[PDB]
Design a protein around this ligand. Structure first.
Ligand SMILES: [Mg+2]
Ligand SMILES: [Mg+2]
Ligand SMILES: [Mg+2]
Ligand SMILES: [Zn+2]
Lengths: 153, 211, 108, 292, 166
């Protein structure tokens, strides 16, 4: 009976879970694109989004600095969070991270894998799933339906 | 190797005779040409006479023709034992290597024109005689499963080929055996395989890009 | 508790060939438009993804040389330029990573 | 009798096939190069006038066979089952291409032809049904249209809902048969002979023959049914999955000969539609279509 | 040990006469000493039975089992020799007629236990066999209709005879 609980049980315990997640978050901020097991990447996605919000609060905020200090073990990253990532995501209200499933791991444990990144990074674009064009057969028929309904009141 | 390896034939042709463009006609001339190159080739004939003494260009084409017909007919029966006597060790793998697990039906239709010796050479000592053959033949090759993959069951097509025979003059038990065929550049292309082929393009790893 | 009788191959064949124990056939396998290799509908193409990361490693390798040591992350945005490209006015005051190869067609 | 026309028309169709098949003696090899994005550079050594683009797809893999609806031979759309004629570069088109304009037309034309086949055999042999034309309508119109002239006896009978439902049942039967769309490029003379009785078809053949420098006219056959075509068609009738004969509308200026336009919608297996989406599209396919 | 599966590719039939259906090609291939349980390999071999070559490869590429890659590699080798050596025209025109696993020669080792007791462990090997038959996969299985079931029942009734009498 684990109804309503919003966390995975990871690592050696609750504290170990935080540290495992913290290490992934630290890697994500530095490199902006990280591969982990799909479950662990999903666990860390929420923290990645909330960290940007703390960065938006501002450099001078004391709580933001303490939060940034705890989560970014490599302390050179803290300037990056407040002066690079937060300015980038000023317009958005959320959805800063992009997470997609990668083919399973070829390492005899066949782990389910994911790629987690921050949006807007400098790295080569991921091969995202592109929806079909309006020129396809089904789309054109729907486009015809849309035009008639809009034009005819 | 303590014992020297024994070779009864030599791979290749000592001097590859170049057929004259247009020779495939009127199906003299080439008869004169062997006379014309007598210095290069008659001397070879003279040496062949010494070790043989019964080598007459007049009668060799008949014997040379006979070997050609019989050698191929072994392919139908697949009598490799006979065929080894008829052809040299250089010729044998070329004829038979790709016919394994296949059945070939080959027959000889009447010869269009008389066979003629066209070029001979000598080198312990080997003597090679090139002969010119124009003949109509039939060929059909099948799969393991009996399905036809090449040729037409029974239609005669005229063939002009130049076949090199060879003999080991020194050996007492040597004989004239089919050795090689010289293909002229001007020859028309042979019939294509019945089936259709895919020639794969370059395979590229993720790093690479097509060009 | 230990077995009271040997289990016959007739019983055993019913256990290990029951449909519940068989490998399910997958209906979500599709071919990738760009590379022409196989993929699952909900999963990224592994061939195309393989291209992206190996280019990423090349970029990150160049980054390591420029920084030269740990704890040298910039406080300014980063940008990658390939041979034949020069920083624009908007590119002013941003770390530039230089790559010997030409700009990949897919990368823009 | 109508059965006789099917027999005689089929005989002429087969006679032309053998004549062209016999026309090519021996085997001549044509090199056709794959120019598509995937598997680039592959060269298919095919036989002239016998092999088809489907055979090239067979060499590569089953994905090409299942997903390829059309081929681009030297920049022109070709039927998958139309024998290749000369050395060229070939590319395979699918329904999910970024701009599948040519594929959409071929699917639309084929579905219209399937409508004609159903109509001919639907009515009782007592009445006389004559196929006039299949107007070329944009896919945006929302339905494919086939024009037909029924007997004067039915000059004021209109199909009911059950009658229209009956038509779709025949169409689905055609799909289940999985009949390949045979292709012939034939000179006017033979096409006119096959379609001598139908005045409407005859004039259409004349137009489509004058258009080309020679008298070549495209003929396509589904089973026994035969028809003239505006261009390339789908490989097989199994491509269609959802099919509907939406409605029939009488063309008002048809006093000399009452022409009734038949309308329907279809979608391939590759692009299926959800239940609700299909219903809404079907409703919009029951409205008149004006060729533009 | 016996190695008859390899020999089957050497059978040569006589030329077919003009009035006869074209014989489909058959290719036999195997990989012998595979470090993998035959019981485990059966499931992978079972799944691809009857499928086309491309369909079998697609399913194997996305299976997480160790044996899937082994079977896939064998299937690709079988495909190449079919076209290269057995006069198969189209690579795609192939289906899995037979696919099964057999026991290999195994090695006996010692499994240590708690109190100086031991057990005999087996280092298991297995073989994998396939036959590829040219042509589309045979049509799938069609279940009996209700009318077919009724017809069989009536035949049983009509077969009844008066038993143990003249
Ligand atoms: Mg939960
Ligand atoms: Mg122990
Ligand atoms: Mg045991
Ligand atoms: Zn891809």
């Amino acid at each position: 009976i684990s109804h309503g609980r919003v966390y995975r049980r990871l690592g050696l315990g609750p504290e170990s879970r935080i540290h495992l997640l913290r290490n992934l978050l630290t890697g994500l901020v530095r490199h902006e694109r990280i591969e982990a097991t799909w479950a662990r990447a999903d666990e860390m996605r929420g923290y990645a989004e909330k960290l940007i919000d703390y960065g938006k609060l501002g450099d001078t905020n004391e709580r933001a600095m303490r939060m940034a200090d705890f989560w970014l073990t490599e302390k050179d990253l803290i300037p990056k969070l407040f002066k690079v990532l937060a300015p980038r995501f000023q317009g958005q209200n959320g959805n800063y991270t992009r997470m997609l499933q990668i083919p399973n791991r070829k390492e005899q444990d066949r782990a389910k894998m994911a790629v987690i990144e921050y949006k807007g990074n400098y790295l080569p674009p991921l091969p995202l799933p592109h929806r079909d064009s309006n020129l396809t057969l089904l789309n054109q028929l729907l486009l015809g339906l849309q035009q008639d309904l809009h034009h005819n009141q | 190797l303590e014992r020297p390896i024994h070779l009864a034939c030599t791979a290749g042709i000592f001097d590859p005779y170049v057929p004259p463009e247009g020779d495939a006609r009127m199906s003299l001339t080439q008869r004169t040409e062997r006379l014309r190159k007598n210095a290069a080739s008659q001397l070879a004939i003279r040496k062949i006479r010494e070790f043989d003494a019964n080598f007459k260009t007049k009668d060799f084409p008949e014997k040379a023709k006979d070997i050609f017909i019989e050698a191929h007919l072994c392919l139908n029966n697949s009598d490799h034992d006979r065929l080894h006597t008829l052809v040299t060790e250089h010729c044998f793998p070329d004829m038979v290597w790709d016919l394994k697990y296949k059945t070939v039906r080959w027959g000889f239709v009447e010869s269009l024109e008389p066979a003629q010796v066209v070029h001979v050479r000598c080198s312990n000592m080997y003597g090679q005689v090139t002969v010119r053959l124009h003949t109509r033949q039939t060929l059909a090759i099948y799969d393991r499963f009996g399905r036809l993959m090449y040729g037409q069951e029974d239609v005669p097509k005229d063939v002009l080929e130049y076949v090199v025979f060879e003999r080991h003059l020194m050996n007492p038990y040597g004989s004239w055996r089919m050795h090689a065929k010289i293909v002229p550049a001007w020859a028309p292309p042979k019939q294509p395989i019945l089936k259709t082929l895919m020639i794969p393009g370059p395979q590229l790893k993720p790093w690479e890009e097509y060009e | 508790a230990a077995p009271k009788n040997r289990r016959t191959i007739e019983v055993n064949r019913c256990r290990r060939r029951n449909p519940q124990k068989l490998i399910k056939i997958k209906n979500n396998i599709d071919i990738c438009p760009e590379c022409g290799h196989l993929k699952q509908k909900h999963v990224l193409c592994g061939y195309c993804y393989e291209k992206v990361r190996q280019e990423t490693t090349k970029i990150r390798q160049q980054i390591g040389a420029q920084e030269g040591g740990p704890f040298r992350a910039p406080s300014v945005e980063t940008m990658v330029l390939y041979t034949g490209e020069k920083p624009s006015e908007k590119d002013q005051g941003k770390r530039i990573v230089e790559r010997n190869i030409k700009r990949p067609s897919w990368f823009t | 009798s109508p059965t006789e026309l099917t027999e005689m028309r089929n005989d002429l169709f087969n006679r032309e096939k053998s004549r062209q098949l016999s026309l090519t003696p021996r085997t001549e090899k044509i090199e056709v190069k794959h120019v598509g994005k995937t598997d680039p550079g592959t060269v298919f050594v095919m036989n002239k006038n016998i092999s088809t683009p489907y055979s090239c797809a067979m060499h590569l893999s089953e994905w090409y066979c299942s997903k390829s609806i059309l081929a681009l031979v030297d920049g022109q759309p070709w039927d998958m089952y139309k024998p290749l004629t000369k050395s060229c570069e070939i590319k395979f088109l699918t329904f999910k291409d970024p701009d599948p304009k040519e594929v959409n037309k071929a699917y639309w034309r084929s579905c219209a032809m399937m409508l004609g086949c159903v109509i001919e055999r639907a009515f009782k042999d007592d009445y006389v049904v004559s196929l006039v034309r299949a107007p070329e309508v944009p896919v945006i119109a929302g339905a494919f249209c086939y024009d037909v002239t029924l007997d004067k006896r039915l000059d004021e009978w209109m199909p009911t809902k059950e009658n229209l439902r009956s038509f779709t049942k025949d169409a689905h039967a055609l799909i289940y048969r999985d009949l390949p769309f045979e292709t012939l490029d034939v000179d006017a003379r033979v096409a006119l002979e096959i379609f001598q009785h139908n005045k409407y078809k005859v004039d259409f053949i004349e137009e489509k023959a004058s258009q080309n420098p020679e008298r070549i006219v495209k003929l396509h056959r589904i089973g026994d049914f035969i028809d003239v075509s505006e261009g390339p068609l789908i490989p097989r009738t199994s491509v269609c999955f959802q099919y509907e004969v939406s409605a029939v509308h009488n063309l008002n200026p048809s006093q000399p000969n009452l022409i009734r336009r038949f309308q329907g919608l279809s979608l391939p297996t590759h692009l299926r539609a959800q239940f609700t989406i299909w219903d809404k599209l079907v409703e919009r396919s029951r409205k008149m279509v004006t060729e533009d | 040990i016996s190695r008859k599966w390899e020999k089957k590719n050497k059978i040569v039939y006589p030329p077919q006469l003009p009035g006869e259906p074209r014989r489909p090609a058959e290719i036999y291939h195997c990989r012998r000493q595979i470090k993998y349980s035959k019981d485990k390999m059966w499931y992978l071999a079972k799944m691809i039975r009857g499928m086309s070559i491309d369909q079998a490869l697609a399913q194997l590429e996305f299976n997480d089992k160790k044996g899937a890659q082994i079977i896939k590699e064998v299937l690709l080798e079988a495909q190449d020799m079919a076209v290269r050596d057995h006069n198969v025209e189209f690579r795609s025109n192939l289906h899995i007629a037979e696919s099964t696993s057999g026991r290999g020669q195994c090695l006996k080792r010692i499994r240590y236990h708690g109190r100086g007791r031991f057990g005999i462990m087996e280092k298991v090997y297995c073989h994998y066999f396939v036959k590829l038959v040219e042509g589309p996969p045979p049509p799938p299985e069609v279940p009996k209709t209700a009318v077919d079931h009724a017809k069989d029942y009536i035949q049983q009734l009509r077969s009844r005879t008066i038993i143990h009498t003249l």
